[PDB]
């Protein structure tokens, strides 16, 4: 049924956002409302639309200035917070750029301030020739025409190319709108503005993977083995100019259908490129994905050789963890997609039971997927807030929670260990090796002497201090 939690008695509109799956229900009657306005003052976990554009997607690129047209905070706030390495020395994580908007610019306009900042950035780093300009709350409100500024700068500086995104934080209700605006602007303005050499009979884009802890680099070892050319990665370890070539690919392989389905859908409509949805987390899922890719290209045997080798390498370790994780209860409190990517893969491959899931910004589509794959007796929460998390903990008693680090630090007080469901602990987590990495972190989080020690009150004469025995795969 839908659930009205005790902490929500005064915001009873939350009942429509929380589903407890029970036997025999027609799930079609219980789909949480999702992607609706946030309730003020709740300590919702949601971020803003600008985040979804610059932090999540655009900022992943290795060779592009990320010009944030706004006051300095939006830039400071999106710097030193992500884990998406590159193969060029992590340029993307080392720098952030602001137009340092001041009151004069609010009153009289910020377009000259943006122009000057763009020239400065290109002057200070003469090897960098690509830029994305993002609007933020105040620059959107005052109506600065960043597309016009960018066209002037490109006329004055023939060596550069600039893309613009209008994505103030108050747009939409969450990070999701930022995804959408970026996707649709990029296909409309930049795809089909360059071509690259095709070096394989088999070509794809990999859409919706952002190289968290090297996930894209790990997957690339599969594509290189198979002989498949990736025209563009959207956007993990990617380049701005690769993304201008996406129309060239034979196949679009999508992992994050939430952030990046938009561009896949448009590339199919405009260019005829089929969209293949996969799961690039999960051991048996990754094998299914490789088999579908290879079936599409008519390279089935190559795929079987790769899969056999990876199972021989990694399956024994995965099974070691499965034996010790079977039956443990997990909660996943992340953006959305990881819920549907992980609920059944952790169950199938590790024996782990996902008892509670919360999505900051998922759409109804993401709930359809997660409820299809998820368990009876599990809570499914759209746009969860902090008090709800405490009540859900009481209700389901997880052994581990996959969530962000600040929530991890809160639930530690309750003696519940966490794994960073966003940036990972010791990743990468995609692929065959990556699921073993995930499993290891889950095992070390749960089988941790510190948790047992923290429970002991040394003042209690009836209590001793235990010693716990661990293992390693």
């Amino acid at each position: 049924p839908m659930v009205l939690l005790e902490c929500d008695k005064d915001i009873p509109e939350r009942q429509k956002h929380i589903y407890l799956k029970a036997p025999n229900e027609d799930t079609r009657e219980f789909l949480p409302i999702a992607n609706a306005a946030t309730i003020p003052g709740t300590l919702s976990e949601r971020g803003c639309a600008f985040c979804g554009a610059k932090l999540v997607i655009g900022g992943v690129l290795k060779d592009t200035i990320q010009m944030i047209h706004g006051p300095l905070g939006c830039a400071y706030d999106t710097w030193h917070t992500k884990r998406y390495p590159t193969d060029n020395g992590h340029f993307n994580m080392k720098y952030v750029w602001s137009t340092d908007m001041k009151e004069s610019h609010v009153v009289f306009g910020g377009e000259k301030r943006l122009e000057k900042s763009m020239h400065e950035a290109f002057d200070e780093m003469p090897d960098i020739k690509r830029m994305i300009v993002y609007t933020t709350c105040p620059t959107a409100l005052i109506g600065d025409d960043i597309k016009a500024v960018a066209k002037k700068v490109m006329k004055d500086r023939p060596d550069v190319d600039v893309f613009t995104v209008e994505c103030p934080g108050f747009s939409g209700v969450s990070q999701s709108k930022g995804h959408h605006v970026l996707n649709i602007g990029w296909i409309n303005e930049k795809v089909e503005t360059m071509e690259k050499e095709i070096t394989s009979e088999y070509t794809m884009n990999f859409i919706g993977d952002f190289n968290i802890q090297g996930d894209t680099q790990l997957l690339q070892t599969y594509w290189d083995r198979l002989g498949i050319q990736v025209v563009a990665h959207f956007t993990g370890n990617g380049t701005y100019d690769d993304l201008r070539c996406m129309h060239q690919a034979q196949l679009n392989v999508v992992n994050c259908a939430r952030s990046s389905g938009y561009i896949a859908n448009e590339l199919k409509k405009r260019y005829g490129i089929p969209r293949l949805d996969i799961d690039s987390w999960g051991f048996n899922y990754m094998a299914e994905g490789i088999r579908k890719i290879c079936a599409f290209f008519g390279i089935e045997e190559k795929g079987e050789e790769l899969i056999a080798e990876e199972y021989a390498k990694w399956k024994p370790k995965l099974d070691w963890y499965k034996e010790r994780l079977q039956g443990k209860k997990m909660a996943i409190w992340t953006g959305g997609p990881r819920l549907w990517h992980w609920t059944k893969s952790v169950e199938d491959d590790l024996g782990v039971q996902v008892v509670a899931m919360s999505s900051k910004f998922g759409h109804e589509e993401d709930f359809e997927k997660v409820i299809a794959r998820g368990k009876e007796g599990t809570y499914y929460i759209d746009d969860g807030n902090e008090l709800e998390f405490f009540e859900i903990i009481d209700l389901v008693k997880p052994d581990v929670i996959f969530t962000g680090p600040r929530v991890g630090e809160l639930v530690k007080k309750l003696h519940i260990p966490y794994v960073n469901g966003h940036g990972y602990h010791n990743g990468p987590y995609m692929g065959f090796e990556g699921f073993v990495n995930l499993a290891r972190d889950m095992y070390n989080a749960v089988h941790n002497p510190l948790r047992h020690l923290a429970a002991v009150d040394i003042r209690d004469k009836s209590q001793t201090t235990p010693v716990i025995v661990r293992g390693a795969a």
Partner: protein
């Protein structure tokens, strides 16, 4: 020799040193018991700052958003503020204080925060006749100042709100102390100093419990300790000791103007002299003697620093960046130990104030090497100077400058905020005698590890 003040020569920023005003106002607010700041603007302005505090402290702190969306950005956001206040009050029955913090968005669209507060006070009085919730308007447009100025603005607004409600009463016999933006370990050290001097004081804000235990009963103790009552009692103090010109002195000035509580602004107590002068001012205002225990702690610090100064520190060139009170204070500490702070970077538009800081003249009169003080600086200003050939032996600053030091192969000591890329720093004092000792030993230890990794006379670390 010459101490030159110069502004950043670029309009834009690369690698900002500070966050925006609202972030600093959130930091002020989280130090108050039974307080949840409400940040009126888009969601990022809240969530990214909750993350920043988790990076520095490895803890959660509660801050709420009004969740400004497109409707409110076009037609006004008053109803979001009003709804957010009520939703907080309904769901947090112990909540007492809500600083309502504006952002760029809600400054640009002109929302009337004082009006929304009147509306909310009526609504709260009607719905919760036995509670008192203090709503403080905090005007923090991000297109002025920085987190430093936002902190100061929030402290001042919250004190104005609470003391307006309670006014002056019984003299408390206590000092007010505004340390500025310091770590829990700094607050621990100040509490020890006052205890050893037999001086009763409230430290605003008391963030000692931000380093909270994992307890057997699973209780959550990660809260500010400064209460409404503590704040209200500021109007009744003997005197205010303000340790940071840019981080709370304007509240001490307000309490002097409103309540006749004399404010004594001293140099922020980085290093030996500045600590000595702070203790002298406490003894003057209170009539209490400085105790032998502090003479001993002083002496232990000097003994430790003397094992390092002429051997390892002399003539070594240092760049320092951070909050202005910290930059100027650490530059003074560096010269006590024979370091040469040749480049000081301060990160906001407050240069008209910095030029009049008496510590700049104090540096002018003790330095025998040129010093460049860049105001309105970003961290690109540091990286660009190193690229152009500035030879540094040490960087002192916060963790968002880490890649500059890493790539230039320069040892770096983490000071100020945020210090997320090392463990436990928030627990270690930087001010006072113990803090000068700890800072000096971190500097030496960073240098020692660098000599090993670079094989630069690594054999010398035996009989120093």
């Amino acid at each position: 020799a010459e101490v030159k003040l110069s502004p950043r020569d670029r309009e834009g920023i690369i690698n900002p040193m500070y966050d925006c005003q609202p972030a600093g106002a959130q930091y002020a607010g989280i130090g108050i018991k039974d307080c949840i700041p409400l940040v009126h603007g888009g969601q990022g302005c809240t969530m990214f700052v909750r993350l920043l505090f988790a990076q520095h402290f490895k803890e959660n702190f509660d801050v709420a958003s009004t969740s400004l969306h497109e409707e409110s950005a076009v037609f006004g956001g008053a109803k979001r503020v009003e709804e957010g206040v009520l939703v907080l009050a309904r769901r947090y029955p112990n909540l007492r204080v809500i600083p309502i913090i504006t952002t760029c968005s809600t400054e640009v669209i002109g929302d009337d925060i004082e009006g929304s507060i009147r509306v909310c006070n009526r609504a709260l009085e009607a719905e919760f006749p036995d509670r008192k919730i203090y709503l403080a308007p905090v005007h923090t447009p991000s297109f002025k100042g920085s987190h430093v100025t936002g902190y100061a603005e929030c402290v001042k607004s919250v004190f104005k709100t609470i003391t307006d409600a309670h006014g002056k009463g019984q003299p408390s016999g206590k000092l007010n102390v505004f340390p500025g933006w310091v770590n829990p370990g700094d607050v621990v050290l100040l509490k020890r100093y006052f205890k050893e001097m037999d001086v009763e004081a409230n430290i605003y804000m008391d963030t000692e419990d931000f380093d909270s235990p994992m307890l057997p009963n699973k209780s959550i103790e990660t809260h500010g300790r400064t209460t409404v009552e503590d704040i209200a009692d500021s109007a009744n103090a003997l005197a205010t000791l303000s340790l940071a010109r840019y981080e709370g002195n304007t509240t001490g000035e307000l309490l002097q103007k409103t309540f006749a509580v004399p404010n004594a602004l001293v140099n922020t107590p980085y290093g030996i002299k500045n600590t000595d002068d702070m203790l002298r001012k406490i003894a003057e205002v209170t009539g209490k003697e400085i105790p032998e225990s502090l003479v001993r702690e002083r002496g232990i610090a000097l003994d430790a620093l003397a094992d390092l100064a002429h051997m390892f520190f002399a003539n070594k060139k240092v760049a320092i960046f951070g909050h202005p009170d910290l930059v100027l204070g650490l530059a003074q500490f560096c010269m006590e130990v024979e370091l040469e702070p040749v480049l000081l970077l301060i990160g906001d538009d407050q240069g008209n104030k910095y030029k009049k800081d008496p510590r700049i003249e104090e540096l002018k009169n003790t330095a025998h090497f040129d010093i460049e003080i860049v105001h309105n600086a970003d961290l690109w200003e540091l990286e660009k100077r190193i690229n152009a050939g500035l030879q540094l032996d040490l960087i002192m600053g916060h963790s968002k400058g880490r890649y500059v030091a890493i790539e230039a192969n320069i040892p770096m000591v983490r000071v100020g905020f945020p210090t997320f890329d090392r463990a436990g720093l928030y627990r270690k004092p930087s001010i006072g005698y113990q803090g000068a000792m700890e800072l000096g030993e971190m500097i030496a230890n960073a240098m020692f590890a660098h000599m090993e990794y670079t094989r630069n006379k690594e054999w010398i670390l035996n009989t120093w």
